[PDB]
Amino acid sequence: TPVEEAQQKTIEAITKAINYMAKRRIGALLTIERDTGMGDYIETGIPLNAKVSSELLINIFIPNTPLHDGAVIMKNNEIAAAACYLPLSESPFISKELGTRHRAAVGISEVTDSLTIIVSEETGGVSVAKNGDLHRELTEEALKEMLEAE
Amino acid sequence: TPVEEAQQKTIEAITKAINYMAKRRIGALLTIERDTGMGDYIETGIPLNAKVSSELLINIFIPNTPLHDGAVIMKNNEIAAAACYLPLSESPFISKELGTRHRAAVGISEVTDSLTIIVSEETGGVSVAKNGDLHRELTEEALKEMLEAE
Ligand SMILES: CC(C)NC(=O)Nc1ccccc1
Ligand SMILES: [Mg+2]
């Protein structure tokens, strides 16, 4: 159906952008709003309300640019805003070598049902935060399964 | 009115982005649609349909990124698409040292009433193409006045 084709197109756009950033070890933080509304965090960023594309996602996260500092938040199949604030987790159970990008992803996942994708700037490793937990060292197959499950 | 305030915000966003890119010698090609519809050219690019911001305009044009090659086309207060094709002018009044961005800008200006801004990656100079003419080496003040008058 139209809705299904649109969801698959967005999943493909995300995975392509994530693959590009993982290869180049470009740090990234991408939160997908679900049932819990995140308007209050969207409002902290730069409004975009833009169509999703792998190209736009990549251009947002390029290091040392206006938009790369903070989270992209997606809502209703669009990029709602970039450079958004997310709350930092105080969980003592996050791997100690990880920094604020991952703690922000876990933090928003503690108070929403959202799914957040993180690319490490140190390793290019890809992880997902959901329900207060961080799922690390994901393959492409694993991230896709997570997006389809979501 | 709200229409006039939105226009002023878009002009402020455009001028801030152009000023930033000029200082850094970031090549840019930005066409503002007017009364002649540019749908045929918009459809050649990557759709964004995004709210304008100086930050997004800058991020689009960062060298060696997916979106930087080709024109950004704006429709009113939105970035409609990036990496768009524009036709190349054959006018003999284009300085011979100028490259394809300037020739594309004059080209679209010959078949539309649009206003196109170009930042040279060679010199950082700012120019505008309108009605088949290229006006070069604009001050910040002159550009803003041209946009306000448009
Ligand atoms: C060089 C690596 C880091 N290449 C990848 O493509 N990794 C990756 C990990 C999770 C999801 C998608 C891609
Ligand atoms: Mg002059």
Swiss-Prot record, chains A, B:
Subunit structure: Probably a homodimer. Interacts with CdaR. May interact with GlmM.
Keywords annotated in UniProt: ATP-binding, Cell membrane, Membrane, Nucleotide-binding, Nucleotidyltransferase, Transferase, Transmembrane, Transmembrane helix
Membrane topology category: Multi-pass membrane protein
Its job: One of 3 paralogous diadenylate cyclases (DAC) in this bacteria, catalyzing the condensation of 2 ATP molecules into cyclic di-AMP (c-di-AMP). Upon expression in E.coli leads to c-di-AMP synthesis. Probably the main producer of c-di-AMP for the cell; is probably implicated in control of peptidoglycan synthesis. In B.subtilis c-di-AMP is a second messenger that mediates growth, DNA repair and cell wall homeostasis; it is toxic when present in excess.
GO molecular function, one term: diadenylate cyclase activity
Enzyme class: transferase
Identification of the protein by name: Cyclic di-AMP synthase CdaA
Location within or outside the cell: Cell membrane
Organismal lineage: Bacteria, Bacillati, Bacillota, Bacilli, Bacillales
Record carries keyword Kinase: no
Keyword Nuclease belongs to the record: no
Known EC number: 2.7.7.85
Principal location: membrane
